[PDB]
């Protein structure tokens, strides 16, 4: 419960970061942990698969013809690359809406290279550039589909947000009062719930993919979760973008898991049943959720990759694709190596 | 002690950050604390007044004619504004050296607005653009002055770095073995020592300023320390830059204190004797040092400003110049305030 990632300069402690993590089976049962695995935690973008489920379950959304890449964008914190903006526009045309209907705002790109090119051309980002633009088009779609009208689709009193709030609690297996709600950077309601339940959501996504693959009679909701998993794993460049952790992670694993960033350094992974998960002592899929207490994103990616290695998820060759995140470079302005990152935590079973 | 600064979204905890702080008198005696006031801490740029002392105490350096603004740049983590680069080049001319003699490297500017101009211009920062460039020119100056040789002025075996190492330990009142050393981003040795001793350095700076102002006989060391304080207080724009915390802080206080940032969220302040310092229980100058365990810079400035309020240093009107740092904006992409910062820590005496 005193679990840290620690950075050093020449062996001298620089910063230390408290780690919380939960590893759960398909029913949410805790298998491993770091820190406080039930920490009440703001899920932010890590909750988007649950918001995508509310959208996909809305009567009439099926008629718009969203494809797997559209759903991946719904699930995205994308880098605002030109292909992300283009897909946002295509999805707006599917529901006969326009950029002015979006109630999210522009922000500097989550990708440094994209942001640099915007600065170079004095580009001012707008609503269609939001990292959450696919989720917002999906919410516009649901509001239009049930004839609720698009103005106010983002407000808590709107039936689309009523559907979101109910769906999040159901996937977490919590009562409505056990989920807290604030306002997100994209101006939508955003939930907070115990960290282990974020893992439970992703364990259910991977379990639904396994059940779909195995030809099981799934409920419609399990079918839709299977679809969300498949969409994310098939189009991981839409979920984030070039150079991004989530994209590189999901590409490396080639369908064996999905992974998603949450704001202020949280992360969730849904792992399909495998030799690794069976070795970990469960007979189904697995869920992983992580939170760095102070919010440092660089440390998040380092810790998640170390956790994948300790859990034996993937092969050493597969995870070596993430080496630049696992041990972030610590070189000074003259090319001299001056420091490092250590993982003194111990996963408890 | 469980001393934190905490951010929230709608009252839901987002991130928390552990706080360490030391408030010391002129002899180093601990008056108040947060967290662990003796935490072994890399001083990084907060050590620069001690490095400047070692420069100014190198025999012959007086002959180059560095003025107070030059000395303020030796003490700086500047924003690489054009005036900082220009002064660096002027200082190299004073010592008949060239940019190729520097052993620090360029880096993206510490100022977002400067770095935005650089991006629009495709400007590549070079050695004279380093936030440490003034310190490096001073070290070259001292190497030249004693006849050592400029090659290797930055290496631990060089007499300039031997002088730095001895000077840091003396100011801290530590044996050599109680100061650890690593290599800095600017490619110089950088010390680590207990956090309270950083406060001690700055108490001694402010105490020397008081002794000079009162006309007391001073040792060559105290006279040099008083000069460093005066240079920083008179030229705070050289120590950091427009819009930077250290510059706004020192301008607001108009000579009553000096302050300096260290990388990975450390800060140090030397306070001249005043009603505030007497009210705090000491009869001379005071030093303050702070470290955010996880290295978040926004949180550091919020904590330092909150600490000055709690210590009664300044007036509500002097401190209000720092209001944007004290309570950082938490506004989303649509202009809605979504949260805030809180200070659940308790000063202890
Ligand atoms: Cl470095
Ligand atoms: Zn969002
Ligand atoms: Zn430096």
Numbering used by the authors:
A (entry chain B), B (entry chain A): 4 to 352
Sentences from the study reporting this entry:
The ReAV enzyme from Rhizobium etli, a representative of Class 3 L-asparaginases, is sequentially and structurally different from other known L-asparaginases. Asparaginases (EC 3.5.1.1) catalyze the hydrolysis of L-asparagine, generating L-aspartate and ammonia. ReAV is a homodimeric protein, with each subunit containing a highly specific zinc-binding site created by two cysteines, a lysine, and a water molecule. Two Ser-Lys tandems (Ser48-Lys51, Ser80-Lys263) are located in the close proximity of the metal binding site, with Ser48 hypothesized to be the catalytic nucleophile.
The positively charged Arg47 side chain participates in salt-bridge interactions with the carboxylate side chains of Asp187, Asp267, and Glu17 from the adjacent protein chain, creating a network of H-bonds that supports the dimer structure. Furthermore, the crystal structure of the ReAV protein in complex with L-Asn showed that the guanidinium group of Arg47 stabilizes the position of the substrate α-carboxylate group. Thus, replacing the protonated Arg47 side chain with alanine disrupted the hydrogen bond network in this region, rendering the mutant protein inactive. The crystal structure of this mutant revealed that the absence of Arg47 caused only minor structural rearrangements and atomic shifts in the active site region, which were nearly identical in the four protein chains. The substitution of Arg47 by alanine affects the conformation of Glu17, which can no longer form H-bonds to the Nη atom of Arg47 of the complementary subunit. The metal binding site is conserved in the mutant structure and fully occupied with Zn2+. High difference electron density peaks were detected in the close vicinity of the Ser48 hydroxyl, as previously observed in both the ReAIV and ReAV crystal structures, and these peaks were interpreted as three water molecules forming very short H-bonds with the Ser48 Oγ atom (O…O 2.30–2.50 Å), as well as within their triangle (2.40–2.50 Å). The hydrogen bond network at the Ser-Lys tandems (Ser48-Lys51 and Ser80-Lys263) closely resembles that of the WT protein. Only one conformer of Asp187 is observed in the electron density maps, with one of its Oδ atoms forming an H-bond to the water molecule from the metal coordination sphere. The R47A mutant was inactive as well, due to its inability to anchor the L-Asn substrate in the active site.
